[PDB]
Amino acid sequence: MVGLTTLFWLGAIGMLVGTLAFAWAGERYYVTLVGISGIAAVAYVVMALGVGWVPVAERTVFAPRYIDWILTTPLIVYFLGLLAGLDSREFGIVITLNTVVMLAGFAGAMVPGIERYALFGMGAVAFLGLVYYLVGPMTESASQRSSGIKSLYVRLRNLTVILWAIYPFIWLLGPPGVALLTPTVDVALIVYLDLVTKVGFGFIALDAAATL
Numbered sequence: 001m002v003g004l005t006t007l008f009w010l011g012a013i014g015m016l017v018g019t020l021a022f023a024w025a026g027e028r029y030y031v032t033l034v035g036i037s038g039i040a041a042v043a044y045v046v047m048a049l050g051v052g053w054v055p056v057a058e059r060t061v062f063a064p065r066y067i068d069w070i071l072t073t074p075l076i077v078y079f080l081g082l083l084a085g086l087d088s089r090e091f092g093i094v095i096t097l098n099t100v101v102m103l104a105g106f107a108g109a110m111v112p113g114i115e116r117y118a119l120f121g122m123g124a125v126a127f128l129g130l131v132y133y134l135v136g137p138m139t140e141s142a143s144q145r146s147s148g149i150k151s152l153y154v155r156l157r158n159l160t161v162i163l164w165a166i167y168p169f170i171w172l173l174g175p176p177g178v179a180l181l182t183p184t185v186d187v188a189l190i191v192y193l194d195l196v197t198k199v200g201f202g203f204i205a206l207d208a209a210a211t212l
């Protein structure tokens with residue numbers, strides 16, 4: 001009743017609506033949000049068309065998803081770093097940590113053997129370091145800003161930390177890992193998370209930009 005392609009098209013449509021909304025409302029921030037959802041839109045269309053479905057051992061891996069994540073997640077961290085007022089050096093640490101997470105996941109998904117769990121573990125370790133910087137140093141830094149900017153940062157930060165922490169569990173329970181969850185359910189859960197961590201993220205920012 002509901003195929004993989006249908007779910008990919010749904011994500012594509014959701015990202016497109018977000019993209020046009022952010023472009024219209026567009027204060028770097030608006031251009032970043034267009035990139036976050038605009039890139040994801042393209043990845044989902046490509047996948048909806050059946051492009052980039054790579055067979056690996058006995059699983060199917062969706063390569064456009066990881067290219068998407070590698071480009072869009074640093075833009076989300078960049079957005080948060082602007083809100084917090086990071087110096088160009090602190091940016092380097094968190095964006096480096098983020099890239100390690102994304103690359104490790106991409107490599108683990110593409111490796112047929114159990115070495116892929118070794119790659120997954122490395123991304124998990126780097127993710128914990130990323131969470132520390134979001135909850136600690138970046139929160140200290142955001143404190144120096146107006147009370148409204150600080151409030152916006154805290155709300156986007158918690159949205160980000162809570163939801164991003166769910167992805168490694170979906171990955172591990174899905175085809176890439178123990179292959180427990182079926183591809184259709186696993187994809188459905190990730191389409192939901194992508195939409196919330198990108199388009200939902202964006203709309204929470206727009207809402208605050210009008211309350212000024």
Ligand SMILES: *C/C=C(C)/C=C/C=C(C)/C=C/C1=C(C)CCCC1(C)C
Pocket residue numbers: 040069072073101102104105106120123124127164165167168171194197198
């Ligand atoms: C728009 C897309 C988003 C916000 C994707 C987020 C994905 C993650 C936070 C994935 C994290 C992972 C780990 C922490 C360990 C290795 C496997 C990953 C890539 C699923």
Ligand SMILES: [Cl-]
Pocket residue numbers: 060061062065109176
């Ligand atoms: Cl995958």
